Structure formats: C-alpha cells, structure tokens
Amino acid sequence: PLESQYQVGPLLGSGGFGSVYSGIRVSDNLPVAIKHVEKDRISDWGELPNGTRVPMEVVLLKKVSSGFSGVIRLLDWFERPDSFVLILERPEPVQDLFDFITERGALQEELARSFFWQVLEAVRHCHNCGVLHRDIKDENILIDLNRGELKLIDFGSGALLKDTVYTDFDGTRVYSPPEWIRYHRYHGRSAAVWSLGILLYDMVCGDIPFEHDEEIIRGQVFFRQRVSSECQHLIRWCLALRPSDRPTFEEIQNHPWMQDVLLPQETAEIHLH
Ligand SMILES: Nc1ncnc2c1ncn2[C@@H]1O[C@H](COP(=O)(O)OP(=O)(O)NP(=O)(O)O)[C@@H](O)[C@H]1O
Ligand SMILES: [Mg+2]
C-alpha cells in the first residue's frame, strides 16, 4: 500500500494549499517527502513510457530523475481515486532558498555565485532531459545544508521542452517574461533565462526586482544593494527585453562573474557552517 511502506510525519512548508508530508521509508529509514496532488487541480496530463495516464508533473519528474543531478528525484508514485501521491527524496537538514534569503538577507556574491551556478547546472540537466520547469524561483529550490547542494523542486507548472512557441503558463507571474505579460507567448529557453535573471537579482539584493506588470515590461533594473558591475551586467543581460538578446546557458556560465565557483562542500563549510 502506502501507509505501510512509509511512516508519515508532519506537513512541510508554510502557507499555501498544497500537501507535502515529511516521511520515512520503513524499508531503509530513508528520508522522503510525500507530495499529494489533487486530480481536479491537474490541468496538464501526460502518459508514461507504458502509456498510463498521469499528471505531467510525474512525466517530467521521471524524465529528470535518472541518475544524479541537482533535481529532487521521484522515488515512486501512487494513484488514488481523487489524487496522486509522489514519493520524493528529502534532504535533511534542509531549508528552501526563500527562507534562507529571508533570514540572511542579500547574499554575499561568492555564495550567490555558488548557488546560481548549481541552479544553472540543474536547469541544464532538465533541458537535456527534454523538460522545461517553468517555475524557477527561490521557493522551488532546496538547500541540502550539510552538503552545500541545491535541489530543484516542483515541476507542477512544467512542460515537455519544445522549440515552438508556448501560449500557456501557470508559473509565478513576477518571474515571467515581458513577452508573456504583453503577448501571452514565449519560448522555453529564453523565458527560463529571464526567470534566472530574476532569481540572481533576488539572491544578491534580497528581494525580486519587479512586483508589477508595468515594471516587468519596462525592464529597468534598479539595484537596491551594492552589487558588483560584473554581476549587474549578467543580471541585466538575462533581463533583456527582447528574448533573442538574452544569453544562452553557455554564455551565462562563461560570463566573467561566474568564474572560479566554489565547490558545494566548500560552500557549506564557508557559508552554511
Ligand atoms: N523533496 C522535498 N524535501 C523537503 N521538502 C519538500 C520537498 N518537496 C516539497 N517540500 C516542501 O513542500 C513545499 C511545497 O512543495 P511543492 O512541490 O511546491 O508542493 P505544492 O503543491 O506546489 N504546494 P504550494 O507550492 O505551497 O502551492 C515546499 O515549500 C517545501 O517546504
Ligand atoms: Mg509549488
């Protein structure tokens, strides 16, 4: 069943209408997260290799959960009459990046560099697996505090990666690009890069740059904290108004500000210990 294979603990997270529980796999006492998804809340369905009807979130998790990566892996899933239950890896101790920034404030650039680099590697992994996350933000990034490793979570707004235009979007609006706000259309990669620019600004300034649609479409970036010129340049490049003017993942990682990144363990010893 499910209640027999796992020892269910308390609900995780604060606020929201989701239902993710802390759990432990009885067989080996492995820490897990038990995520419940309401069928009536599912708008995008897909089919696994076998051809079964499941939430797109499951399809995408399966595609990226092969091997090691900076993405939280799906260990198993169950279908119930009115919902699906996903068993996910659970780092311990852990803290999501949103809470981390709330407590620490704007992050030192060395730390932001390490974190951003890991997010880039995780997103590249997703794209390599043919998956577009569509909801990259601090709330969807978990920090494995002891290892200094970041993990991407929640593919509930994702889609299969494609080269044609997307005209649907259910991610976080303040991280969405101007082309979506104005024309209700975008391409996967350039929209992802825009969200990464928002995330990087969030890390080095302690809050997102835009709150209203008018600010997003104007694209003017004001830095509220002291940020190096190189970092500002990278952020402004990711936030270019024209999609084709934004950097590719390769250009981001070859940017001067991204050089000499700390290793995950070094990051934990210096900034998380
Ligand atoms: N693998 C995990 N390990 C530890 N905590 C997790 C894990 N997955 C999810 N959580 C917690 O559950 C919360 C929401 O996860 P999420 O995948 O966004 O579920 P959700 O259905 O989209 N609920 P919400 O985002 O609040 O509307 C996060 O804020 C975490 O604190
Ligand atoms: Mg969520």
Side-chain angles (χ1 to χ4, degrees), residues 12-21 32-33 35-37 57 72-73 88-91 94 96 99 137 139-140 142 153-156:
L12 297 175
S14 64
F17 297 69
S19 300
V20 182
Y21 299 77
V32 300
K35 177 173 181 180
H36 298 255
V37 180
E57 187 173 349
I72 284 296
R73 303 170 67 182
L88 307 165
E89 289 176 336
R90 171 168 65 81
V94 67
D96 70 49
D99 288 344
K137 58 173 174 173
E139 298 181 72
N140 290 332
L142 299 181
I153 60 163
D154 194 3
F155 289 76

PDB file of all heavy atoms in Angstrom, residues 12-21 32-33 35-37 57 72-73 88-91 94 96 99 137 139-140 142 153-156, ligand 1:
ATOM      1  N   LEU A  12       4.909  19.703   5.690  1.00  0.00           N
ATOM      2  CA  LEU A  12       6.079  20.536   5.477  1.00  0.00           C
ATOM      3  C   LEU A  12       5.661  21.855   4.848  1.00  0.00           C
ATOM      4  O   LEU A  12       4.599  21.950   4.232  1.00  0.00           O
ATOM      5  CB  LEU A  12       7.073  19.826   4.554  1.00  0.00           C
ATOM      6  CG  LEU A  12       7.669  18.519   5.074  1.00  0.00           C
ATOM      7  CD1 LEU A  12       8.528  17.891   3.988  1.00  0.00           C
ATOM      8  CD2 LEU A  12       8.496  18.788   6.323  1.00  0.00           C
ATOM      9  N   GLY A  13       6.496  22.873   5.016  1.00  0.00           N
ATOM     10  CA  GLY A  13       6.204  24.171   4.437  1.00  0.00           C
ATOM     11  C   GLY A  13       5.261  25.044   5.238  1.00  0.00           C
ATOM     12  O   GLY A  13       4.654  24.604   6.215  1.00  0.00           O
ATOM     13  N   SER A  14       5.144  26.298   4.817  1.00  0.00           N
ATOM     14  CA  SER A  14       4.271  27.256   5.478  1.00  0.00           C
ATOM     15  C   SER A  14       3.336  27.875   4.450  1.00  0.00           C
ATOM     16  O   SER A  14       3.749  28.192   3.331  1.00  0.00           O
ATOM     17  CB  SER A  14       5.099  28.356   6.142  1.00  0.00           C
ATOM     18  OG  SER A  14       5.803  29.111   5.170  1.00  0.00           O
ATOM     19  N   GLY A  15       2.075  28.038   4.832  1.00  0.00           N
ATOM     20  CA  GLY A  15       1.101  28.626   3.933  1.00  0.00           C
ATOM     21  C   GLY A  15       0.875  27.811   2.676  1.00  0.00           C
ATOM     22  O   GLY A  15       1.507  26.774   2.468  1.00  0.00           O
ATOM     23  N   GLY A  16      -0.032  28.284   1.831  1.00  0.00           N
ATOM     24  CA  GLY A  16      -0.322  27.580   0.600  1.00  0.00           C
ATOM     25  C   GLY A  16      -1.401  26.531   0.780  1.00  0.00           C
ATOM     26  O   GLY A  16      -1.805  26.220   1.904  1.00  0.00           O
ATOM     27  N   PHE A  17      -1.858  25.976  -0.336  1.00  0.00           N
ATOM     28  CA  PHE A  17      -2.902  24.965  -0.318  1.00  0.00           C
ATOM     29  C   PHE A  17      -2.399  23.584  -0.718  1.00  0.00           C
ATOM     30  O   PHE A  17      -3.191  22.708  -1.065  1.00  0.00           O
ATOM     31  CB  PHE A  17      -4.041  25.383  -1.247  1.00  0.00           C
ATOM     32  CG  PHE A  17      -4.733  26.650  -0.825  1.00  0.00           C
ATOM     33  CD1 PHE A  17      -4.079  27.876  -0.903  1.00  0.00           C
ATOM     34  CD2 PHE A  17      -6.037  26.615  -0.344  1.00  0.00           C
ATOM     35  CE1 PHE A  17      -4.714  29.050  -0.508  1.00  0.00           C
ATOM     36  CE2 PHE A  17      -6.683  27.785   0.055  1.00  0.00           C
ATOM     37  CZ  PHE A  17      -6.019  29.005  -0.027  1.00  0.00           C
ATOM     38  N   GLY A  18      -1.084  23.391  -0.665  1.00  0.00           N
ATOM     39  CA  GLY A  18      -0.519  22.102  -1.022  1.00  0.00           C
ATOM     40  C   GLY A  18      -0.496  21.156   0.163  1.00  0.00           C
ATOM     41  O   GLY A  18      -0.867  21.538   1.274  1.00  0.00           O
ATOM     42  N   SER A  19      -0.069  19.919  -0.075  1.00  0.00           N
ATOM     43  CA  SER A  19       0.006  18.917   0.982  1.00  0.00           C
ATOM     44  C   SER A  19       1.230  18.029   0.803  1.00  0.00           C
ATOM     45  O   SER A  19       1.169  16.988   0.145  1.00  0.00           O
ATOM     46  CB  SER A  19      -1.257  18.052   0.984  1.00  0.00           C
ATOM     47  OG  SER A  19      -2.413  18.839   1.206  1.00  0.00           O
ATOM     48  N   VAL A  20       2.346  18.450   1.386  1.00  0.00           N
ATOM     49  CA  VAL A  20       3.583  17.684   1.310  1.00  0.00           C
ATOM     50  C   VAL A  20       3.971  17.290   2.729  1.00  0.00           C
ATOM     51  O   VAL A  20       4.161  18.149   3.588  1.00  0.00           O
ATOM     52  CB  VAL A  20       4.720  18.512   0.677  1.00  0.00           C
ATOM     53  CG1 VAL A  20       5.979  17.663   0.565  1.00  0.00           C
ATOM     54  CG2 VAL A  20       4.291  19.018  -0.699  1.00  0.00           C
ATOM     55  N   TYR A  21       4.078  15.988   2.973  1.00  0.00           N
ATOM     56  CA  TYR A  21       4.420  15.497   4.303  1.00  0.00           C
ATOM     57  C   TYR A  21       5.828  14.956   4.431  1.00  0.00           C
ATOM     58  O   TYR A  21       6.389  14.406   3.485  1.00  0.00           O
ATOM     59  CB  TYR A  21       3.477  14.369   4.724  1.00  0.00           C
ATOM     60  CG  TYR A  21       2.021  14.733   4.803  1.00  0.00           C
ATOM     61  CD1 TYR A  21       1.245  14.849   3.652  1.00  0.00           C
ATOM     62  CD2 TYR A  21       1.407  14.940   6.039  1.00  0.00           C
ATOM     63  CE1 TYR A  21      -0.107  15.160   3.727  1.00  0.00           C
ATOM     64  CE2 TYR A  21       0.058  15.250   6.124  1.00  0.00           C
ATOM     65  CZ  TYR A  21      -0.695  15.360   4.968  1.00  0.00           C
ATOM     66  OH  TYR A  21      -2.033  15.665   5.052  1.00  0.00           O
ATOM     67  N   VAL A  32      12.088  10.923   3.180  1.00  0.00           N
ATOM     68  CA  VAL A  32      11.369  11.235   1.953  1.00  0.00           C
ATOM     69  C   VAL A  32      10.339  12.324   2.192  1.00  0.00           C
ATOM     70  O   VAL A  32      10.051  12.692   3.331  1.00  0.00           O
ATOM     71  CB  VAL A  32      10.615  10.006   1.390  1.00  0.00           C
ATOM     72  CG1 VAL A  32      11.593   8.885   1.067  1.00  0.00           C
ATOM     73  CG2 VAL A  32       9.566   9.535   2.390  1.00  0.00           C
ATOM     74  N   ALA A  33       9.808  12.850   1.095  1.00  0.00           N
ATOM     75  CA  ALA A  33       8.764  13.861   1.143  1.00  0.00           C
ATOM     76  C   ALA A  33       7.612  13.224   0.388  1.00  0.00           C
ATOM     77  O   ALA A  33       7.796  12.688  -0.706  1.00  0.00           O
ATOM     78  CB  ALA A  33       9.212  15.140   0.451  1.00  0.00           C
ATOM     79  N   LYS A  35       4.330  14.000  -1.415  1.00  0.00           N
ATOM     80  CA  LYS A  35       3.529  15.061  -2.020  1.00  0.00           C
ATOM     81  C   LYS A  35       2.216  14.579  -2.629  1.00  0.00           C
ATOM     82  O   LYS A  35       2.200  13.699  -3.492  1.00  0.00           O
ATOM     83  CB  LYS A  35       4.360  15.785  -3.087  1.00  0.00           C
ATOM     84  CG  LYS A  35       3.599  16.862  -3.837  1.00  0.00           C
ATOM     85  CD  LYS A  35       4.518  17.664  -4.756  1.00  0.00           C
ATOM     86  CE  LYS A  35       3.746  18.762  -5.473  1.00  0.00           C
ATOM     87  NZ  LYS A  35       4.626  19.570  -6.381  1.00  0.00           N
ATOM     88  N   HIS A  36       1.115  15.172  -2.175  1.00  0.00           N
ATOM     89  CA  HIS A  36      -0.211  14.813  -2.666  1.00  0.00           C
ATOM     90  C   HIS A  36      -0.707  15.839  -3.675  1.00  0.00           C
ATOM     91  O   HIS A  36      -0.684  17.042  -3.414  1.00  0.00           O
ATOM     92  CB  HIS A  36      -1.201  14.733  -1.499  1.00  0.00           C
ATOM     93  CG  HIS A  36      -0.854  13.695  -0.481  1.00  0.00           C
ATOM     94  ND1 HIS A  36      -1.529  12.498  -0.379  1.00  0.00           N
ATOM     95  CD2 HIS A  36       0.102  13.670   0.478  1.00  0.00           C
ATOM     96  CE1 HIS A  36      -1.004  11.780   0.597  1.00  0.00           C
ATOM     97  NE2 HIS A  36      -0.012  12.469   1.133  1.00  0.00           N
ATOM     98  N   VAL A  37      -1.157  15.358  -4.827  1.00  0.00           N
ATOM     99  CA  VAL A  37      -1.665  16.233  -5.873  1.00  0.00           C
ATOM    100  C   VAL A  37      -3.120  15.881  -6.170  1.00  0.00           C
ATOM    101  O   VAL A  37      -3.443  14.726  -6.446  1.00  0.00           O
ATOM    102  CB  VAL A  37      -0.833  16.090  -7.161  1.00  0.00           C
ATOM    103  CG1 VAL A  37      -1.381  17.011  -8.240  1.00  0.00           C
ATOM    104  CG2 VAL A  37       0.628  16.420  -6.871  1.00  0.00           C
ATOM    105  N   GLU A  57       3.417  16.459 -14.098  1.00  0.00           N
ATOM    106  CA  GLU A  57       4.455  16.556 -13.081  1.00  0.00           C
ATOM    107  C   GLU A  57       5.183  15.225 -12.922  1.00  0.00           C
ATOM    108  O   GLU A  57       6.398  15.193 -12.744  1.00  0.00           O
ATOM    109  CB  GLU A  57       3.848  16.988 -11.742  1.00  0.00           C
ATOM    110  CG  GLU A  57       4.880  17.274 -10.665  1.00  0.00           C
ATOM    111  CD  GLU A  57       4.268  17.865  -9.409  1.00  0.00           C
ATOM    112  OE1 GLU A  57       3.075  18.242  -9.438  1.00  0.00           O
ATOM    113  OE2 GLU A  57       4.986  17.962  -8.397  1.00  0.00           O
ATOM    114  N   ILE A  72      15.508  17.213  -7.273  1.00  0.00           N
ATOM    115  CA  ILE A  72      14.959  16.259  -6.307  1.00  0.00           C
ATOM    116  C   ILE A  72      14.344  15.124  -7.114  1.00  0.00           C
ATOM    117  O   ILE A  72      13.508  15.357  -7.987  1.00  0.00           O
ATOM    118  CB  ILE A  72      13.874  16.914  -5.415  1.00  0.00           C
ATOM    119  CG1 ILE A  72      14.534  17.810  -4.364  1.00  0.00           C
ATOM    120  CG2 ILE A  72      13.031  15.842  -4.732  1.00  0.00           C
ATOM    121  CD1 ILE A  72      15.412  17.066  -3.377  1.00  0.00           C
ATOM    122  N   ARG A  73      14.749  13.895  -6.808  1.00  0.00           N
ATOM    123  CA  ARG A  73      14.276  12.735  -7.547  1.00  0.00           C
ATOM    124  C   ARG A  73      13.000  12.073  -7.047  1.00  0.00           C
ATOM    125  O   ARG A  73      12.734  12.020  -5.842  1.00  0.00           O
ATOM    126  CB  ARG A  73      15.396  11.698  -7.614  1.00  0.00           C
ATOM    127  CG  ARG A  73      16.668  12.236  -8.251  1.00  0.00           C
ATOM    128  CD  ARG A  73      17.833  11.274  -8.099  1.00  0.00           C
ATOM    129  NE  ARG A  73      17.647  10.046  -8.867  1.00  0.00           N
ATOM    130  CZ  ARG A  73      18.512   9.038  -8.870  1.00  0.00           C
ATOM    131  NH1 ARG A  73      19.620   9.115  -8.143  1.00  0.00           N
ATOM    132  NH2 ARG A  73      18.275   7.957  -9.600  1.00  0.00           N
ATOM    133  N   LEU A  88       9.186  11.604  -2.883  1.00  0.00           N
ATOM    134  CA  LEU A  88      10.386  12.315  -3.306  1.00  0.00           C
ATOM    135  C   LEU A  88      11.528  12.227  -2.308  1.00  0.00           C
ATOM    136  O   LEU A  88      11.318  11.994  -1.119  1.00  0.00           O
ATOM    137  CB  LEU A  88      10.049  13.796  -3.510  1.00  0.00           C
ATOM    138  CG  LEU A  88       8.875  14.148  -4.423  1.00  0.00           C
ATOM    139  CD1 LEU A  88       8.468  15.599  -4.198  1.00  0.00           C
ATOM    140  CD2 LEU A  88       9.268  13.920  -5.872  1.00  0.00           C
ATOM    141  N   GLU A  89      12.743  12.423  -2.808  1.00  0.00           N
ATOM    142  CA  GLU A  89      13.923  12.434  -1.956  1.00  0.00           C
ATOM    143  C   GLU A  89      13.746  13.619  -1.015  1.00  0.00           C
ATOM    144  O   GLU A  89      13.157  14.631  -1.398  1.00  0.00           O
ATOM    145  CB  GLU A  89      15.183  12.687  -2.782  1.00  0.00           C
ATOM    146  CG  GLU A  89      15.625  11.563  -3.681  1.00  0.00           C
ATOM    147  CD  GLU A  89      16.829  11.961  -4.516  1.00  0.00           C
ATOM    148  OE1 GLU A  89      17.022  13.179  -4.744  1.00  0.00           O
ATOM    149  OE2 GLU A  89      17.577  11.060  -4.952  1.00  0.00           O
ATOM    150  N   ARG A  90      14.249  13.502   0.208  1.00  0.00           N
ATOM    151  CA  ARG A  90      14.161  14.604   1.157  1.00  0.00           C
ATOM    152  C   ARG A  90      15.493  14.840   1.851  1.00  0.00           C
ATOM    153  O   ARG A  90      15.947  14.013   2.640  1.00  0.00           O
ATOM    154  CB  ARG A  90      13.083  14.352   2.224  1.00  0.00           C
ATOM    155  CG  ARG A  90      13.108  15.388   3.361  1.00  0.00           C
ATOM    156  CD  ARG A  90      11.869  15.320   4.258  1.00  0.00           C
ATOM    157  NE  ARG A  90      11.761  14.073   5.014  1.00  0.00           N
ATOM    158  CZ  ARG A  90      12.416  13.807   6.142  1.00  0.00           C
ATOM    159  NH1 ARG A  90      13.240  14.703   6.670  1.00  0.00           N
ATOM    160  NH2 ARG A  90      12.238  12.639   6.750  1.00  0.00           N
ATOM    161  N   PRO A  91      16.156  15.965   1.541  1.00  0.00           N
ATOM    162  CA  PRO A  91      17.439  16.256   2.185  1.00  0.00           C
ATOM    163  C   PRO A  91      17.170  16.572   3.654  1.00  0.00           C
ATOM    164  O   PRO A  91      16.092  17.055   3.999  1.00  0.00           O
ATOM    165  CB  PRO A  91      17.939  17.483   1.423  1.00  0.00           C
ATOM    166  CG  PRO A  91      17.309  17.332   0.069  1.00  0.00           C
ATOM    167  CD  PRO A  91      15.909  16.886   0.417  1.00  0.00           C
ATOM    168  N   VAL A  94      17.435  20.548   5.844  1.00  0.00           N
ATOM    169  CA  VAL A  94      17.146  21.286   4.620  1.00  0.00           C
ATOM    170  C   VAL A  94      16.424  22.601   4.910  1.00  0.00           C
ATOM    171  O   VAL A  94      15.817  22.778   5.969  1.00  0.00           O
ATOM    172  CB  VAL A  94      16.259  20.432   3.676  1.00  0.00           C
ATOM    173  CG1 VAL A  94      14.890  20.239   4.295  1.00  0.00           C
ATOM    174  CG2 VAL A  94      16.129  21.094   2.309  1.00  0.00           C
ATOM    175  N   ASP A  96      14.528  25.844   2.288  1.00  0.00           N
ATOM    176  CA  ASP A  96      14.379  26.340   0.926  1.00  0.00           C
ATOM    177  C   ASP A  96      15.073  27.688   0.802  1.00  0.00           C
ATOM    178  O   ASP A  96      15.291  28.388   1.793  1.00  0.00           O
ATOM    179  CB  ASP A  96      12.901  26.413   0.488  1.00  0.00           C
ATOM    180  CG  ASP A  96      12.108  27.496   1.191  1.00  0.00           C
ATOM    181  OD1 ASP A  96      12.566  28.656   1.257  1.00  0.00           O
ATOM    182  OD2 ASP A  96      10.989  27.186   1.653  1.00  0.00           O
ATOM    183  N   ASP A  99      13.354  30.933   2.349  1.00  0.00           N
ATOM    184  CA  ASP A  99      13.535  31.103   3.787  1.00  0.00           C
ATOM    185  C   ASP A  99      14.975  31.481   4.117  1.00  0.00           C
ATOM    186  O   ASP A  99      15.228  32.236   5.056  1.00  0.00           O
ATOM    187  CB  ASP A  99      13.162  29.817   4.536  1.00  0.00           C
ATOM    188  CG  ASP A  99      11.667  29.556   4.548  1.00  0.00           C
ATOM    189  OD1 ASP A  99      10.891  30.491   4.255  1.00  0.00           O
ATOM    190  OD2 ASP A  99      11.265  28.417   4.867  1.00  0.00           O
ATOM    191  N   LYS A 137      12.394  29.654  -9.154  1.00  0.00           N
ATOM    192  CA  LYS A 137      12.327  30.738  -8.175  1.00  0.00           C
ATOM    193  C   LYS A 137      12.888  30.207  -6.862  1.00  0.00           C
ATOM    194  O   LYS A 137      13.045  28.998  -6.700  1.00  0.00           O
ATOM    195  CB  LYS A 137      10.882  31.224  -7.979  1.00  0.00           C
ATOM    196  CG  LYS A 137       9.878  30.159  -7.536  1.00  0.00           C
ATOM    197  CD  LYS A 137       8.532  30.796  -7.205  1.00  0.00           C
ATOM    198  CE  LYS A 137       7.475  29.749  -6.907  1.00  0.00           C
ATOM    199  NZ  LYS A 137       6.209  30.380  -6.417  1.00  0.00           N
ATOM    200  N   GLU A 139      11.565  29.847  -3.995  1.00  0.00           N
ATOM    201  CA  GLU A 139      10.634  28.967  -3.285  1.00  0.00           C
ATOM    202  C   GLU A 139      10.713  27.526  -3.772  1.00  0.00           C
ATOM    203  O   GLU A 139      10.292  26.601  -3.067  1.00  0.00           O
ATOM    204  CB  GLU A 139       9.194  29.441  -3.461  1.00  0.00           C
ATOM    205  CG  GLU A 139       8.892  30.811  -2.908  1.00  0.00           C
ATOM    206  CD  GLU A 139       7.441  31.178  -3.112  1.00  0.00           C
ATOM    207  OE1 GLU A 139       6.579  30.592  -2.421  1.00  0.00           O
ATOM    208  OE2 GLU A 139       7.161  32.037  -3.972  1.00  0.00           O
ATOM    209  N   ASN A 140      11.233  27.329  -4.980  1.00  0.00           N
ATOM    210  CA  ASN A 140      11.342  25.984  -5.537  1.00  0.00           C
ATOM    211  C   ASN A 140      12.758  25.429  -5.561  1.00  0.00           C
ATOM    212  O   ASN A 140      13.082  24.545  -6.358  1.00  0.00           O
ATOM    213  CB  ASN A 140      10.732  25.938  -6.941  1.00  0.00           C
ATOM    214  CG  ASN A 140       9.226  26.079  -6.918  1.00  0.00           C
ATOM    215  OD1 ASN A 140       8.578  25.706  -5.936  1.00  0.00           O
ATOM    216  ND2 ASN A 140       8.655  26.606  -7.996  1.00  0.00           N
ATOM    217  N   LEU A 142      15.704  23.888  -2.890  1.00  0.00           N
ATOM    218  CA  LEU A 142      16.005  23.417  -1.541  1.00  0.00           C
ATOM    219  C   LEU A 142      17.508  23.363  -1.350  1.00  0.00           C
ATOM    220  O   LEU A 142      18.252  23.030  -2.274  1.00  0.00           O
ATOM    221  CB  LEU A 142      15.415  22.025  -1.312  1.00  0.00           C
ATOM    222  CG  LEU A 142      13.893  21.919  -1.426  1.00  0.00           C
ATOM    223  CD1 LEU A 142      13.476  20.484  -1.136  1.00  0.00           C
ATOM    224  CD2 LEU A 142      13.220  22.875  -0.459  1.00  0.00           C
ATOM    225  N   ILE A 153      12.886  21.744  -7.087  1.00  0.00           N
ATOM    226  CA  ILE A 153      11.643  21.021  -6.823  1.00  0.00           C
ATOM    227  C   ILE A 153      10.453  21.646  -7.538  1.00  0.00           C
ATOM    228  O   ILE A 153      10.554  22.729  -8.122  1.00  0.00           O
ATOM    229  CB  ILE A 153      11.302  20.960  -5.310  1.00  0.00           C
ATOM    230  CG1 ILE A 153      11.134  22.370  -4.746  1.00  0.00           C
ATOM    231  CG2 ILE A 153      12.390  20.218  -4.565  1.00  0.00           C
ATOM    232  CD1 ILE A 153      10.417  22.401  -3.397  1.00  0.00           C
ATOM    233  N   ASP A 154       9.332  20.930  -7.477  1.00  0.00           N
ATOM    234  CA  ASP A 154       8.044  21.313  -8.054  1.00  0.00           C
ATOM    235  C   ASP A 154       7.937  21.525  -9.553  1.00  0.00           C
ATOM    236  O   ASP A 154       8.056  22.647 -10.048  1.00  0.00           O
ATOM    237  CB  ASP A 154       7.484  22.550  -7.354  1.00  0.00           C
ATOM    238  CG  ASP A 154       6.016  22.777  -7.676  1.00  0.00           C
ATOM    239  OD1 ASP A 154       5.410  21.951  -8.387  1.00  0.00           O
ATOM    240  OD2 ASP A 154       5.456  23.782  -7.216  1.00  0.00           O
ATOM    241  N   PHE A 155       7.673  20.439 -10.269  1.00  0.00           N
ATOM    242  CA  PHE A 155       7.504  20.502 -11.713  1.00  0.00           C
ATOM    243  C   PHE A 155       6.023  20.587 -12.069  1.00  0.00           C
ATOM    244  O   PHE A 155       5.618  20.265 -13.188  1.00  0.00           O
ATOM    245  CB  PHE A 155       8.141  19.275 -12.370  1.00  0.00           C
ATOM    246  CG  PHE A 155       9.641  19.290 -12.337  1.00  0.00           C
ATOM    247  CD1 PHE A 155      10.332  19.000 -11.163  1.00  0.00           C
ATOM    248  CD2 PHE A 155      10.365  19.629 -13.475  1.00  0.00           C
ATOM    249  CE1 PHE A 155      11.722  19.048 -11.123  1.00  0.00           C
ATOM    250  CE2 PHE A 155      11.755  19.681 -13.448  1.00  0.00           C
ATOM    251  CZ  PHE A 155      12.438  19.389 -12.271  1.00  0.00           C
ATOM    252  N   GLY A 156       5.223  21.042 -11.106  1.00  0.00           N
ATOM    253  CA  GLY A 156       3.790  21.170 -11.305  1.00  0.00           C
ATOM    254  C   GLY A 156       3.335  22.194 -12.331  1.00  0.00           C
ATOM    255  O   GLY A 156       2.149  22.242 -12.667  1.00  0.00           O
TER     256      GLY A 156
HETATM  257  N1  LIG B   1      11.604  16.878  -1.630  1.00  0.00           N
HETATM  258  C1  LIG B   1      11.276  17.732  -0.596  1.00  0.00           C
HETATM  259  N2  LIG B   1      12.001  17.744   0.547  1.00  0.00           N
HETATM  260  C2  LIG B   1      11.698  18.565   1.565  1.00  0.00           C
HETATM  261  N3  LIG B   1      10.661  19.405   1.497  1.00  0.00           N
HETATM  262  C3  LIG B   1       9.881  19.459   0.393  1.00  0.00           C
HETATM  263  C4  LIG B   1      10.169  18.612  -0.712  1.00  0.00           C
HETATM  264  N4  LIG B   1       9.252  18.870  -1.668  1.00  0.00           N
HETATM  265  C5  LIG B   1       8.437  19.781  -1.244  1.00  0.00           C
HETATM  266  N5  LIG B   1       8.774  20.179   0.029  1.00  0.00           N
HETATM  267  C6  LIG B   1       8.073  21.184   0.861  1.00  0.00           C
HETATM  268  O1  LIG B   1       6.716  21.356   0.383  1.00  0.00           O
HETATM  269  C7  LIG B   1       6.545  22.732  -0.081  1.00  0.00           C
HETATM  270  C8  LIG B   1       5.809  22.807  -1.410  1.00  0.00           C
HETATM  271  O2  LIG B   1       6.409  21.865  -2.293  1.00  0.00           O
HETATM  272  P1  LIG B   1       5.652  21.926  -3.705  1.00  0.00           P
HETATM  273  O3  LIG B   1       6.285  20.988  -4.649  1.00  0.00           O
HETATM  274  O4  LIG B   1       5.748  23.414  -4.232  1.00  0.00           O
HETATM  275  O5  LIG B   1       4.104  21.486  -3.387  1.00  0.00           O
HETATM  276  P2  LIG B   1       2.899  22.436  -3.924  1.00  0.00           P
HETATM  277  O6  LIG B   1       1.780  21.501  -4.192  1.00  0.00           O
HETATM  278  O7  LIG B   1       3.177  23.189  -5.289  1.00  0.00           O
HETATM  279  N6  LIG B   1       2.349  23.398  -2.633  1.00  0.00           N
HETATM  280  P3  LIG B   1       2.486  25.086  -2.913  1.00  0.00           P
HETATM  281  O8  LIG B   1       3.655  25.442  -3.724  1.00  0.00           O
HETATM  282  O9  LIG B   1       2.635  25.800  -1.488  1.00  0.00           O
HETATM  283  O10 LIG B   1       1.146  25.592  -3.637  1.00  0.00           O
HETATM  284  C9  LIG B   1       7.937  23.389  -0.204  1.00  0.00           C
HETATM  285  O11 LIG B   1       7.751  24.741   0.213  1.00  0.00           O
HETATM  286  C10 LIG B   1       8.767  22.561   0.772  1.00  0.00           C
HETATM  287  O12 LIG B   1       8.942  23.219   2.026  1.00  0.00           O
END
